[PDB]
């Protein structure tokens, strides 16, 4: 059993998470589903990230101690998570003992090393952004004998201040070419190839500066055992849980001796910097593998993207209490191409759910049940061969389907893996259309014939289904029940190498009903 390790990022609880979120956790769940039904041992993470300034201004502000703010936060999340049925394995928090061990031990050993020097951290805070913007990149600059004195932010232009403080640097320009020959090794490794561009363009070639990995301003954090006045950052602290989680340098390794390296990391583009470069160059002075993946989708759009921050917010609980859930994580899964960005309305989800999902594929089903239920009374004729002429070409196209459904999934285009099963689906109802079957039901001499349109419209489903399990928790399993296919092997993959398993005849549901929602 080959493994396959799959991760999504750890998530900052400074606020409620939204669809963005959601999305991100619900694509790294299709693919540990699909993963699993091609037979690998799985072992797909989620977390979220507990420490720094903001968790205490939270914290404090709802009076409270830091633990259990996040403890009510960290039972929203686990709760949408069981909601969305995601299949992870582990959930790892930052502040469990696991990680903070691990965050002490790495932050040690690349000071023992000397990768890891005390210097002074020097840049320009913007309350209403919450970001750091260094002397460069400031818009309408100050100048006083020269130097810049006081600016703008770029994104705001808000007035910032300058913060000075004691912090410990990561010297990563060393590894710069040790990172480049990477890229050039494994030439799939940042994903989408827009990314790696800006990659190399942006950060690289301008000359990789050192890294402030440490702060003195607060103390909500794992401290550093040598200097207890300096507590961890965010990059060592975060990005570190992928392997904390797997137990590594604990009692049981047996987990990270196995899993590590990752087969796939997820996240959205506005971090791809610390998973393609920092993250790599952190696990090269560690001295264990780099990922094998680091894939950035694009972003949910409102306004502006979906941020917790802005209140530009879309509850995925909503969409899942009206909707559905089915609705919901095939929205995600289908209307933003993974890699490109998006813009979130009410009544693209509403079109989506009825005209693909309940209309084109509850339909289907409908019909087909209906049909089997008018003509045969309720038993389907078993498969035998391709009698009608349409049916060459269409036995055909559903193994097509599944070649393009593959290689569409080993990319990771899920929108495009969908948009193919659902050609076939359309193609399902035409066949219908096509080979009137209400014609074919006033002869008693077309019973064959007529027997095969229905064998072949529940083959076509069958197909739909079995390809849909990674997507729709409830939407095969549901057909399945209806259909009454029983054994398990027809809801696997190997079960569509060859076309029409069914040649036993099967009773299908006197009642049935729709699908969705
Ligand atoms: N709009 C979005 N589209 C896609 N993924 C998103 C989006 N918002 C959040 N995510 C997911 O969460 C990760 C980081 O979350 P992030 O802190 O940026 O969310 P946020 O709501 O923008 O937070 P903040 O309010 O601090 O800006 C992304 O890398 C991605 O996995
Ligand atoms: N460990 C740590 C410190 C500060 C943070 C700020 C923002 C996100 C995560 C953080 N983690």
Not at 31 to 38: D, G, L, S, V
Not at 340 to 357: I, K, Q, W
Not at 426 to 455: C, F, H
């Amino acid at each position: 059993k080959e493994t396959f390790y799959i991760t999504t990022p750890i998530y900052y609880p400074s606020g409620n998470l939204h669809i963005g979120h959601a999305y991100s956790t619900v694509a790294g769940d299709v693919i540990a589903r699909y993963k699993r039904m091609q037979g690998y041992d799985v072992r797909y993470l989620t977390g979220t990230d507990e420490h720094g300034q903001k968790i205490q201004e939270k914290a404090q502000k709802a009076g409270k101690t830091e633990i259990e703010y996040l403890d009510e936060m960290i039972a929203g999340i686990k709760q949408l998570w069981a909601k969305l049925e995601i299949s992870n394995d582990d959930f790892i928090r930052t502040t469990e003992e696991r990680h903070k061990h691990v965050v002490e031990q790495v932050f040690e050993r690349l000071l023992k090393q000397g990768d890891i020097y005390l210097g002074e951290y020097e840049g320009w805070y913007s309350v209403p952004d919450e970001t750091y913007y260094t002397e460069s990149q400031l818009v309408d600059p100050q100048y006083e004998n020269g130097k810049i004195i006081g600016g703008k932010s770029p994104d705001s232009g808000h007035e910032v201040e300058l913060v000075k403080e004691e912090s410990y640097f990561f010297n990563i320009s060393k590894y710069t070419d040790r990172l480049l020959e990477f890229y050039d090794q494994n030439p799939d490794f940042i994903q989408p190839p827009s990314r790696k561009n800006e990659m190399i363009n942006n950060f690289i070639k301008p000359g990789l500066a050192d890294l402030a990995v440490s702060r003195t301003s607060f103390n909500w954090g794992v401290h550093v055992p040598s200097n207890p006045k300096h507590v961890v950052y965010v990059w060592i602290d975060a990005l570190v849980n992928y392997i904390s989680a797997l137990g590594y340098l604990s009692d049981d390794e047996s987990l990270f001796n196995k899993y590590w390296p990752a087969d796939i990391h997820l996240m959205a583009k506005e971090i791809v910097r610390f998973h393609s470069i920092i993250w790599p160059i952190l696990l090269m002075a560690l001295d264990l593998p780099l990922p094998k993946k680091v894939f950035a989708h694009g972003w949910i759009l409102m306004d502006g993207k979906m941020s917790k921050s802005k209140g530009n917010v879309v509850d995925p609980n909503i969409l899942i209490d009206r909707y559905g859930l089915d609705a919901t994580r095939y929205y995600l899964m289908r209307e933003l191409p993974f890699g490109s960005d998006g813009v979130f309305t009410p009544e693209a989800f509403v079109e989506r759910t009825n005209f693909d999902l309940a209309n084109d594929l509850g339909n289907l089903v409908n019909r087909t049940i209906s049909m089997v239920n008018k003509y045969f009374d309720g038993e389907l004729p078993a498969y035998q061969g391709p009698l009608h002429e349409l049916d060459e070409e269409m036995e055909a196209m559903a193994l097509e389907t599944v070649k393009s459904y593959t290689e569409s999934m080993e990319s990771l285009q899920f929108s495009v893996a969908l948009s193919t099963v659902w050609k076939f689906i359309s193609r399902t109802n035409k066949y219908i259309d096509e080979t009137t079957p209400w014609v074919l039901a006033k002869d008693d001499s077309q019973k064959d014939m007529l027997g095969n349109v229905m064998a072949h419209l529940v083959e076509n489903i069958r197909y739909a289904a079995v390809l849909l399990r990674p997507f729709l928790t409830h939407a095969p399993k549901e057909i399945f029940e209806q259909l009454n296919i029983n054994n398990p092997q027809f809801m696997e993959f190997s079960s569509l190498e060859q076309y029409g398993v069914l040649n036993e005849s099967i009773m299908v549901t006197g009642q049935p009903k729709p699908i969705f929602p």
